[PDB]
Design a binder for this molecule. Structure first.
Ligand code: NH4
Ligand code: NH4
Lengths: 221, 218
């Protein structure tokens, strides 16, 4: 199970610093170049850097102006990215990836990025962390109900229903930024009309940045 | 640097039909050894990219048998022999010849399906939110196709403008449908100055506009 797991992404202020980690498992870590790729919100993929098996060759995208440093600890099977003097344009999901083959030489990059991690979100902003307020959307045919997850920052929030047992018909809409500088979204689910009042429905909201977990009961009025 | 350009930008296709995504490189990716250093990736919504093709035409381990890579030099093609509903997403080509690594602009595969009218629902503001001092009114348009839909709010038959926020889900990987929320937010005082709150929806699958409303709040 070749597994790459990023960690360290979080809210950070402009001009600050942040260290990302990438734990590898399921293969000989010392045999492969490792890659860092990022994806800013609403944009495509942007290569950031790669490092050779022994850490001798460290290359970066020029646009970073040397603000990042890629390092590696083969003993701990861990890859790192030290991000300094952070800027708003650094906000993005950062992926680490393994390269199946090393460089052929003469500046050529490593090839075949066969495994990518889940990614870790970095948010460069001066605004403060704020947890969400969860409100119910109270509702034979089909009925609809949901939860309003309002006024939180930064992204993301995860929303489940009945602790994950209720997934059919669920739609958790992408968050929208309001003039307040906060995000809000709704999570809805369609259920049998005859189930209202008999089968209880609960939305479990998790906002990791604020360490907030809220379970809200959605009962009919 | 090497510039990667993809065509088309958006590719609507019905399941069962083939799909071809083209990738053009400003520099030849063919080396003297006869190999092309071009890779293809797939990114489904909210997921990490996944390798599909490497070295121009080699299918990665675990990739479905319907994906194939072709081309050489400056032009390459990702070929899906038989598109399926789950193929909705964004596909990127990446050159692996020179540093910096550069990606194409990406191509979004949209799954074409039969027209489906939206199921419209309206939710009044909860008492708990009203106790906090504001009122959000949510209108839900569930499982419709095509994506294009219009929502018009009415407060006591007064057309609303510039006070509503919309959000649309990505294309469902199973039934290839979309869903949309429209949220009208007001202060409790403002919300308590009006009685009827209505949500009017227009869509191709609807022979006529559908409306949903409620009372109270005044
Ligand atoms: N850090
Ligand atoms: N913000």
């Amino acid at each position: 199970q070749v597994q790459l797991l990023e960690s360290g992404g979080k809210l950070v202020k402009p001009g600050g610093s942040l260290r990302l980690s990438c734990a590898a498992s399921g293969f000989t870590f010392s045999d492969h170049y490792m890659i860092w790729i990022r994806q800013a919100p609403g944009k495509g993929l942007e290569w950031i850097s790669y490092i050779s098996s022994s850490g001798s060759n460290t290359i970066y995208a020029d646009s970073l102006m040397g603000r990042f440093t890629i390092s590696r600890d083969n003993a701990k099977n861990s890859l790192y990215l030290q991000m300094n003097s952070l800027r708003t344009e650094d906000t993005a999901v950062y992926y680490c990836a393994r390269a199946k083959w090393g460089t052929m030489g003469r500046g050529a990059p490593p090839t075949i990025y066969d495994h990518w991690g889940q990614g870790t979100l970095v948010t460069v902003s001066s605004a403060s962390t704020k947890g969400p307020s969860v409100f119910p959307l109270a509702p034979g045919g089909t009925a609809a109900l949901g939860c309003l997850v309002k006024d939180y920052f930064p992204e993301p929030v995860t929303v489940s229903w009945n602790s994950g047992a209720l997934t059919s018909g669920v739609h958790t809409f992408p968050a929208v930024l309001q003039s307040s500088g906060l995000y809000s979204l709704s999570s809805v689910v369609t259920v049998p009309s005859s189930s209202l009042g008999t089968q209880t429905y609960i939305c479990n909201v998790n906002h990791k940045p604020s360490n907030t977990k809220v379970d809200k009961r959605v009962e009919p009025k | 640097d090497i510039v990667m350009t993809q065509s088309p930008l958006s590719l609507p296709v019905t399941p069962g039909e083939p799909a071809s995504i083209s990738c053009r490189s400003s520099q030849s990716l063919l080396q003297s050894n006869g190999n092309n250093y071009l890779e293809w990736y797939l990114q489904k919504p909210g997921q990490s990219p996944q390798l599909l093709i490497y070295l121009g035409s080699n299918r990665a381990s675990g990739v479905p048998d319907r994906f194939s890579g072709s081309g050489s030099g400056t032009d390459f093609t990702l070929k899906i022999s038989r598109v399926e509903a789950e193929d909705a997403g964004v596909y990127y080509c990446m050159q692996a010849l020179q540093t910096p690594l550069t990606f194409g602009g990406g191509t979004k595969v949209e799954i074409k399906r039969t027209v489906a009218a939206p199921s419209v629902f309206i939710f009044p503001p909860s008492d708990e939110q009203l106790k906090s001092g504001t009122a959000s009114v949510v209108c839900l348009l569930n499982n419709f196709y095509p994506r294009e839909a219009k929502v018009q709010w009415k407060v006591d038959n007064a057309l609303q403008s510039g006070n509503s926020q919309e959000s649309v889900t990505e294309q469902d990987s199973k039934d290839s449908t979309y869903s949309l929320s429209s949220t009208l937010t007001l202060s409790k005082a403002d919300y308590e100055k009006h009685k009827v709150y209505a949500c009017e929806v227009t869509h191709q699958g609807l022979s006529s506009p559908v409306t949903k409303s409620f009372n109270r709040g005044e």
